[PDB]
Amino acid sequence: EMKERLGTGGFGNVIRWHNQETGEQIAIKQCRQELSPRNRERWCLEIQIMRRLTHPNVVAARDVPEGMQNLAPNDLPLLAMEYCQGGDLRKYLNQFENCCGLREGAILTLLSDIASALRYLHENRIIHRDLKPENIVLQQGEQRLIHKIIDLGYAKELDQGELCTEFVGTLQYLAPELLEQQKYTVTVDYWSFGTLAFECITGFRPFLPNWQPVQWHSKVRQKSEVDIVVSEDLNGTVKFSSSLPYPNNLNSVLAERLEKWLQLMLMWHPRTDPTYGPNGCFKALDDILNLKLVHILNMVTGTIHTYPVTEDESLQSLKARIQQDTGIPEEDQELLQEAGLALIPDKPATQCISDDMDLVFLFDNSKISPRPQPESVSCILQEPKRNLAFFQLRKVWGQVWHSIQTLKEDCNRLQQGQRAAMMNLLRNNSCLSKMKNSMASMSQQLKAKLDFFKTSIQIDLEKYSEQTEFGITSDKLLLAWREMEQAVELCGRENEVKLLVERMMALQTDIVDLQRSTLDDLEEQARELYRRLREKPRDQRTEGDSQEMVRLLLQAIQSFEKKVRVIYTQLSKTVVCKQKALELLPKVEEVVSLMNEDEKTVVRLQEKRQKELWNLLKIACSKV
Amino acid sequence: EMKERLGTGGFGNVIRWHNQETGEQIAIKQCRQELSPRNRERWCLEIQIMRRLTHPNVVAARDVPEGMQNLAPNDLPLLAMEYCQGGDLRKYLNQFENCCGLREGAILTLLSDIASALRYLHENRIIHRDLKPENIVLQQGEQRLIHKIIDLGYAKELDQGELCTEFVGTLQYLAPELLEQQKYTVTVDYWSFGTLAFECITGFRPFLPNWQPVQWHSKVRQKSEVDIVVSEDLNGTVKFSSSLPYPNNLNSVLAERLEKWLQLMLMWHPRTDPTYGPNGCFKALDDILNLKLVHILNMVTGTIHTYPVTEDESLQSLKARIQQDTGIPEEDQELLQEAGLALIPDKPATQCISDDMDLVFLFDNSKISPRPQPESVSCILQEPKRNLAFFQLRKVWGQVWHSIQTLKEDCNRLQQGQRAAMMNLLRNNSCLSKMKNSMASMSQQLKAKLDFFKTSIQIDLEKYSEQTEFGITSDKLLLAWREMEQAVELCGRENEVKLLVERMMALQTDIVDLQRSTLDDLEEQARELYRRLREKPRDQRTEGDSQEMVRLLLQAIQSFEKKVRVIYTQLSKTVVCKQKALELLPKVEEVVSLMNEDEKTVVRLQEKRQKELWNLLKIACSKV
């Protein structure tokens, strides 16, 4: 057996063991080298802790190998535990595509997981203190992944003592008040968990670069109360803000939302959700996580627009909410779902999620071709310069293709906009139109039937013509009995509707004749530079430049405004057809209706032209 | 005016003259150089002959240029004659396409022409003797071409001695018995004409190829009783075949037909077979040429199937004949003519050759795709070993692309099969179907009319309900006046023809749901090699290989069986629709017909229910 180490370091040394046969992957943590009696007595505590209270997101202690117990460099016990393959969070964070601070809801997994983990220990009288991504493995699971935690050498039992007294590795984390200061409560973890997530989101903690033991404890401790971001734009201009940075698209609402949490759950004793005042972690992050939010795309222009709904927010409520932001009355509000299908009114807003997807929305008009893309600092604060950095461009360059991949990403959003927009036109057409249209063809049948009337009454008209002698001596109600034949014959409108359908039939197919008809390249091309820089040797912290990278981001926009114009050109054209049908659906609605009136009720009540014989046959009988 | 030479050589030298103006193209034949008195006296004969007895297929002597009767220091006359532009048969036979022998009926032209030419001279007491394709021009004409003959300086008046004894020329042709042997009759031409056609067909000019005129008379006269082809397969193993080469590609029956003629009309004195006529030439070839034959394509599989008909072979006769060969009873015999149109039964045999142009035939079933396929020897006798042909590959390689061009050619035959097959479906559809179909729409009119009955009788039914009026005088013709309402109401297919169209509408789209119909490239790609070899510098046409050419012919079939399967896949599918309509037609043919009877004529003669008032208005008047 023996291989690597799950989360090596800590107090001793964890090693992956493979019990010859079976197939089980175990992990034992043998002490580095027997130290003082207090340290050994301390370790016996650590192993004692693992043995009890365990749950996911936190490795579960296993039982020492049946006989592999003997083999012990130290006559001291051995800490056995499960083996979690895959993980080493850093390996993830260090990914080249996750650079610049990720940019997906995958941060929720980390939060919801590491939360259920800390919450567990805390309520069990334990403090990990050292919560660095180096001991957070992403073991596989059912669907997504499980954020399990390894080695707990660095621990604090709220009923006796501690364990790890040194610092095996970096300490970029670990709450300040824990930095060899006086006592420390459970709040020490809240800080680690904060900066840890602060990195999973943004892509690095506040003042992360500038050493740690240096003026760090002097600067980071200085000002910036209830703040967060503390880096340095442009040159060495040391600054500190109080809001999640820019290079990261976690979510419109979520951003400015948990921003306050990662701002709160980031300190000493007072941090501890404000809503109550005691502790953050627990309830704090919980409410945010399991919150139901939807996504609306203002196809009018200003893309994106997330709205946090309830477990049953009536759709009627939402339509009004959106109108409040990006105008557009509840009337001309067309909401399609990346498939053209229109939403359901009877069903509550809660439906445009169901365990990325959103709800592409549009309005009524005939189209403008903008695409406002705010450019975060750092890079925008580099356009005037082009003076080239020395190495910082490792991230600077980074947040560029991530800015281009944002244009490619954002383009596909408005693309999914018309893709869903015109999709709707095909529905209210080949259905509640093409069908109605083709059915109105029965008109040729209705007018044709009317002609039989000139063979059942007209042919029967010649019966009173040659019946003659004693009865037509009046000719009273017989006058217009022939003047009405030259009347009903001069009124049909059957051919008329025929010229419309034959010409309209062209549009019916003209529209379906569509569903047919680089920035994508630039995004990939640019990526080549980072993959070549972050992988390049370690002797190039000089040279410095960005002239090429900038020339790419430039061509990205030069090609973005290009595709955008085309998309809105194809969209504005599909709207012309939607209006050319939505208004010309009634043009064939009235014409077909003018038949069940000008024809039906007209020639139907015309039974008098066949009833005026109902008196002639009794008025000419009451004679003699 | 001096130019080239029609058929230069012979006795003197023919030259193309262009009388300055006018535009006429004349041809004069000035003697090489005044020879002995006998030769000159001989030449004066040749020029004397041309001046008389002339007809097409044989240059006609013209009158010496009105002016310039000089440009030659000879006490001897000048032979003037017409100029036939284009021709030099060899130029044709030497075509890279006509290689491997003329694989088309274009051989008939040559035969029927050169025949009418020789037959002419022979009956006029002349023998050309030297009938090499070098003096046979293909002058243009009305439709096809005229195989005219030039220079006769080697002819022989059967009355005024020979013309000019002299070997010269490749000599190859010219009957053996004429090869400086003793006397010679008119049979000497029969041989020339034979080998001449033997070349136009096979392309090899069989009966010993390039063999030396000396080591010929020995290996030629050898056995080969009534034989023809004489070459050497693989190595140098010479053979004597009695049936022309398989790669003739001219016609199924014609091949093995005139094969015996070209076998007969190919020898010396006795052979030339009055076995049915005067001699070969005359009657022989005549009967063959003027024979009427048809072409049937057994779409079942075994393509091709020509049948020699008479001047009036009743079609009933042929159908039985074909059944005898490729089974398929006279019942399930569908014969279409590259247009889907079915043949005419009352019309005889000629019905097919409306003077390629064949008669694509099929049978009844539902498919799976096999197919017969020869390959001829030589090449097939080379697959077991395709390495180092020293030179022979000049023709071997040849009859390969001619084999691939045969696959490309054959493919387009079956392609013209479905191209004509489905062509027929479109006819018996958008016509004797789509028309019948749309007309059955009147059903909605017929059932709709029936509703008037519940306004002319149902509204008149409420008259006897509150009867306080005068709508009866004897209840005589009033009895069935209500029994007919429950009658006309129980006859109105509003659901019959409707169920057919709705279901049929599926087939209407089921057929159009098709329309999805390499080798073309291969044929051309291969050609590149011949064009590169037959043109390869006079010192590199040797070498030895074929490994590449074979790899091509292989990919040809590998791609042939590919397209074939697809074609039969598209065909077998169209047959499914034809049967899905042919059987689902009459069922909608009668139902729609039961309307123009149960509805039209029924409710139309129902004018009596509107005419019984024609007497009530005169029977109640003859009382006053």
Coordinates of N, CA, C and O in Angstrom, one line a residue, chain A residues 138-233:
Chain A
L138 N -12.8 17.9 -3.1 CA -14.0 17.9 -3.7 C -14.4 16.5 -4.2 O -14.6 16.2 -5.3
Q139 N -14.5 15.5 -3.2 CA -14.8 14.2 -3.5 C -16.1 14.1 -4.4 O -17.0 14.9 -4.3
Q140 N -16.2 13.1 -5.2 CA -17.3 12.9 -6.1 C -18.6 12.5 -5.3 O -18.4 12.0 -4.1
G141 N -19.7 12.5 -5.9 CA -20.9 12.1 -5.3 C -22.1 11.7 -6.2 O -21.8 11.2 -7.3
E142 N -23.3 12.0 -5.8 CA -24.4 11.6 -6.6 C -24.4 12.5 -7.9 O -23.9 12.0 -8.9
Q143 N -24.9 13.7 -7.9 CA -24.9 14.6 -9.0 C -23.6 15.4 -9.0 O -22.6 15.1 -9.6
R144 N -23.7 16.6 -8.3 CA -22.6 17.5 -8.2 C -21.5 16.9 -7.3 O -21.4 15.7 -7.1
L145 N -20.7 17.8 -6.7 CA -19.6 17.3 -5.8 C -19.8 17.6 -4.4 O -20.5 18.6 -4.0
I146 N -19.1 16.9 -3.5 CA -19.2 17.1 -2.1 C -17.9 17.7 -1.6 O -16.8 17.2 -1.8
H147 N -18.0 18.9 -0.9 CA -16.8 19.5 -0.5 C -16.3 19.0 0.9 O -16.5 19.7 1.9
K148 N -15.7 17.8 0.9 CA -15.2 17.2 2.1 C -13.9 17.9 2.6 O -13.2 18.6 1.9
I149 N -13.7 17.8 3.9 CA -12.5 18.4 4.6 C -11.6 17.3 5.1 O -12.1 16.2 5.6
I150 N -10.3 17.5 5.0 CA -9.3 16.5 5.4 C -8.7 16.9 6.8 O -9.3 17.7 7.5
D151 N -7.5 16.5 7.0 CA -6.7 16.8 8.2 C -7.2 17.9 9.1 O -7.5 19.0 8.6
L152 N -7.3 17.7 10.4 CA -7.8 18.6 11.4 C -6.7 18.8 12.5 O -7.0 19.2 13.6
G153 N -5.5 18.6 12.1 CA -4.4 18.7 13.1 C -4.5 20.1 13.8 O -4.4 20.2 15.0
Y154 N -4.7 21.1 12.9 CA -4.9 22.4 13.5 C -6.3 22.4 14.0 O -7.3 22.6 13.2
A155 N -6.5 22.2 15.3 CA -7.8 22.2 15.9 C -7.9 22.7 17.3 O -6.9 22.8 18.0
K156 N -9.1 23.0 17.8 CA -9.3 23.5 19.1 C -10.6 23.0 19.7 O -11.7 23.2 19.3
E157 N -10.4 22.1 20.7 CA -11.5 21.5 21.5 C -12.0 22.4 22.5 O -11.3 22.9 23.4
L158 N -13.3 22.8 22.4 CA -13.9 23.7 23.3 C -14.3 22.9 24.6 O -15.4 23.0 25.1
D159 N -13.3 22.2 25.1 CA -13.5 21.4 26.4 C -12.2 20.9 27.0 O -12.2 20.1 27.9
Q160 N -11.1 21.3 26.4 CA -9.8 20.9 26.9 C -8.6 21.7 26.4 O -8.0 22.5 27.2
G161 N -8.3 21.5 25.1 CA -7.2 22.3 24.6 C -7.1 22.3 23.0 O -8.1 22.2 22.3
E162 N -5.9 22.5 22.5 CA -5.7 22.6 21.1 C -4.9 21.4 20.6 O -5.0 20.3 21.2
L163 N -4.1 21.6 19.6 CA -3.3 20.5 19.0 C -2.1 21.1 18.2 O -1.0 21.2 18.8
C164 N -2.3 21.4 17.0 CA -1.2 22.0 16.1 C -0.8 23.4 16.7 O -1.6 24.3 16.8
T165 N 0.5 23.5 17.1 CA 1.0 24.7 17.7 C 1.8 25.6 16.7 O 2.0 26.8 16.9
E166 N 2.2 25.0 15.6 CA 3.0 25.7 14.6 C 2.1 26.1 13.4 O 0.9 26.3 13.5
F167 N 2.8 26.3 12.3 CA 2.1 26.7 11.0 C 2.6 26.0 9.8 O 3.5 26.5 9.1
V168 N 2.2 24.8 9.6 CA 2.6 24.0 8.5 C 2.2 24.5 7.1 O 1.2 24.1 6.5
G169 N 2.9 25.5 6.7 CA 2.6 26.2 5.4 C 2.2 27.6 5.5 O 2.3 28.2 6.6
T170 N 1.6 28.2 4.5 CA 1.1 29.5 4.4 C 0.0 29.7 5.5 O -0.5 28.7 6.0
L171 N -0.3 30.9 5.8 CA -1.3 31.2 6.8 C -2.1 32.4 6.3 O -2.8 33.1 7.1
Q172 N -2.1 32.6 5.0 CA -2.8 33.7 4.4 C -4.2 33.8 5.0 O -4.8 34.9 5.1
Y173 N -4.7 32.7 5.6 CA -6.0 32.7 6.2 C -5.8 32.8 7.7 O -5.0 33.6 8.2
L174 N -6.7 32.1 8.5 CA -6.6 32.2 9.9 C -6.9 33.6 10.4 O -6.1 34.5 10.2
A175 N -8.0 33.8 11.1 CA -8.4 35.0 11.6 C -7.3 35.8 12.3 O -6.4 35.2 12.9
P176 N -7.3 37.1 12.2 CA -6.2 38.0 12.7 C -6.0 37.8 14.3 O -4.9 37.5 14.7
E177 N -7.1 37.8 15.0 CA -7.1 37.6 16.4 C -6.6 36.3 16.8 O -6.3 36.0 18.0
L178 N -6.4 35.4 15.8 CA -5.8 34.1 16.1 C -4.3 34.2 15.8 O -3.6 33.3 16.2
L179 N -3.9 35.2 15.1 CA -2.5 35.4 14.8 C -1.6 35.6 16.0 O -1.0 36.7 16.1
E180 N -1.5 34.6 16.8 CA -0.6 34.6 18.0 C -1.1 35.6 19.1 O -0.4 35.9 20.0
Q181 N -2.3 36.2 18.8 CA -2.9 37.2 19.7 C -3.4 36.4 21.0 O -2.9 35.3 21.2
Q182 N -4.2 37.1 21.7 CA -4.8 36.5 23.0 C -5.7 35.3 22.6 O -5.5 34.6 21.6
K183 N -6.7 35.1 23.4 CA -7.6 34.0 23.2 C -8.3 34.2 21.9 O -8.0 35.1 21.1
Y184 N -9.3 33.3 21.6 CA -10.0 33.3 20.4 C -11.2 32.4 20.5 O -11.1 31.3 21.0
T185 N -12.4 32.9 20.0 CA -13.6 32.2 20.1 C -13.8 31.4 18.8 O -12.8 31.0 18.2
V186 N -15.0 31.0 18.5 CA -15.4 30.3 17.3 C -15.4 31.2 16.1 O -15.4 30.7 15.0
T187 N -15.3 32.5 16.3 CA -15.3 33.5 15.2 C -14.1 33.4 14.3 O -14.1 33.8 13.2
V188 N -13.1 32.7 14.8 CA -11.8 32.5 14.0 C -12.1 31.8 12.7 O -11.5 32.0 11.7
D189 N -13.1 30.9 12.8 CA -13.4 30.1 11.6 C -14.2 31.0 10.6 O -14.0 30.8 9.4
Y190 N -15.1 31.8 11.1 CA -15.9 32.7 10.3 C -15.0 33.5 9.3 O -15.4 33.8 8.2
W191 N -13.8 34.0 9.8 CA -12.9 34.7 9.0 C -12.3 33.8 7.9 O -12.4 34.1 6.7
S192 N -11.8 32.7 8.3 CA -11.2 31.7 7.3 C -12.2 31.4 6.2 O -11.9 31.5 5.0
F193 N -13.4 31.0 6.6 CA -14.5 30.7 5.7 C -14.8 31.9 4.8 O -15.2 31.7 3.7
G194 N -14.7 33.1 5.4 CA -15.0 34.3 4.6 C -14.0 34.4 3.5 O -14.3 34.3 2.3
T195 N -12.8 34.7 3.9 CA -11.7 34.9 2.9 C -11.6 33.7 1.9 O -11.2 33.8 0.8
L196 N -12.0 32.5 2.4 CA -11.9 31.3 1.6 C -13.0 31.5 0.5 O -12.7 31.2 -0.6
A197 N -14.2 31.9 0.9 CA -15.2 32.1 -0.1 C -14.9 33.4 -0.9 O -15.3 33.5 -2.1
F198 N -14.3 34.3 -0.2 CA -14.0 35.6 -0.8 C -13.0 35.3 -2.0 O -12.9 36.2 -2.9
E199 N -12.4 34.2 -2.0 CA -11.4 33.8 -3.0 C -12.2 33.0 -4.1 O -11.9 33.1 -5.3
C200 N -13.1 32.1 -3.6 CA -13.9 31.3 -4.5 C -14.7 32.2 -5.4 O -15.1 31.8 -6.6
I201 N -15.1 33.4 -4.9 CA -15.9 34.3 -5.7 C -14.9 35.2 -6.6 O -14.8 34.9 -7.8
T202 N -14.3 36.2 -5.9 CA -13.4 37.1 -6.6 C -12.2 36.4 -7.2 O -11.9 36.7 -8.4
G203 N -11.6 35.6 -6.5 CA -10.4 34.9 -7.0 C -9.1 35.2 -6.2 O -8.0 34.9 -6.7
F204 N -9.3 35.7 -4.9 CA -8.2 36.0 -4.0 C -8.8 36.8 -2.8 O -9.7 37.6 -2.9
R205 N -8.2 36.7 -1.6 CA -8.7 37.4 -0.4 C -8.3 38.9 -0.6 O -7.6 39.3 -1.5
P206 N -8.7 39.8 0.4 CA -8.4 41.2 0.4 C -7.0 41.6 0.1 O -6.5 41.6 -1.1
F207 N -6.2 41.8 1.1 CA -4.8 42.1 1.0 C -4.0 40.8 1.0 O -3.5 40.4 2.0
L208 N -4.0 40.1 -0.2 CA -3.4 38.8 -0.3 C -2.0 38.8 -0.7 O -1.1 38.0 -0.1
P209 N -1.6 39.6 -1.7 CA -0.2 39.7 -2.1 C 0.8 40.0 -1.1 O 1.5 39.1 -0.6
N210 N 0.9 41.3 -0.7 CA 1.8 41.8 0.3 C 2.0 40.8 1.5 O 1.3 40.9 2.5
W211 N 3.0 40.0 1.3 CA 3.4 39.0 2.4 C 2.2 38.6 3.3 O 1.1 38.4 2.8
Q212 N 2.4 38.6 4.6 CA 1.4 38.2 5.6 C 1.9 38.7 6.9 O 1.2 39.3 7.7
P213 N 3.2 38.5 7.3 CA 3.7 38.9 8.6 C 4.1 40.4 8.5 O 4.2 41.0 9.6
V214 N 4.4 40.9 7.3 CA 4.8 42.3 7.2 C 3.7 43.3 7.6 O 2.9 42.9 8.5
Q215 N 3.7 44.5 7.1 CA 2.7 45.5 7.4 C 1.3 45.0 7.3 O 0.4 45.7 7.5
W216 N 1.2 43.8 6.9 CA -0.1 43.1 6.7 C -0.9 43.4 8.0 O -2.0 44.1 7.9
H217 N -0.5 42.8 9.1 CA -1.1 42.9 10.3 C -1.3 44.4 10.8 O -2.0 44.7 11.7
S218 N -0.6 45.3 10.0 CA -0.6 46.7 10.3 C -1.6 47.4 9.4 O -2.3 48.4 9.8
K219 N -1.5 47.0 8.1 CA -2.4 47.7 7.1 C -3.8 47.1 7.1 O -4.8 47.8 7.2
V220 N -3.8 45.8 7.0 CA -5.1 45.1 7.0 C -5.9 45.4 8.2 O -7.2 45.4 8.2
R221 N -5.3 45.6 9.3 CA -5.9 45.9 10.6 C -6.3 47.4 10.6 O -7.1 47.9 11.4
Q222 N -5.7 48.2 9.7 CA -5.9 49.6 9.6 C -7.2 49.9 8.8 O -7.4 49.2 7.8
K223 N -7.9 50.9 9.2 CA -9.1 51.3 8.5 C -9.9 50.1 8.0 O -9.9 49.0 8.6
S224 N -10.6 50.4 6.9 CA -11.4 49.4 6.2 C -12.3 48.6 7.2 O -12.1 47.4 7.4
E225 N -13.2 49.3 7.9 CA -14.1 48.7 8.8 C -15.3 48.2 8.1 O -16.0 48.9 7.4
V226 N -15.6 46.9 8.3 CA -16.8 46.2 7.6 C -16.5 46.3 6.1 O -17.5 46.3 5.3
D227 N -15.3 46.3 5.7 CA -14.9 46.4 4.3 C -14.5 45.0 3.8 O -14.8 44.0 4.5
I228 N -13.8 45.0 2.7 CA -13.3 43.7 2.1 C -12.2 43.9 1.2 O -11.0 43.6 1.6
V229 N -12.4 44.3 -0.1 CA -11.4 44.4 -1.1 C -10.3 45.4 -0.6 O -10.6 46.5 -0.2
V230 N -9.0 45.0 -0.6 CA -7.9 45.8 -0.2 C -6.7 45.5 -1.0 O -5.7 45.0 -0.5
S231 N -6.7 45.8 -2.3 CA -5.6 45.5 -3.1 C -4.9 46.8 -3.5 O -4.7 47.7 -2.7
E232 N -4.5 46.9 -4.8 CA -3.9 48.1 -5.3 C -3.9 48.3 -6.8 O -3.3 47.5 -7.6
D233 N -4.7 49.2 -7.3 CA -4.9 49.4 -8.7 C -3.7 50.2 -9.3 O -2.8 50.6 -8.5

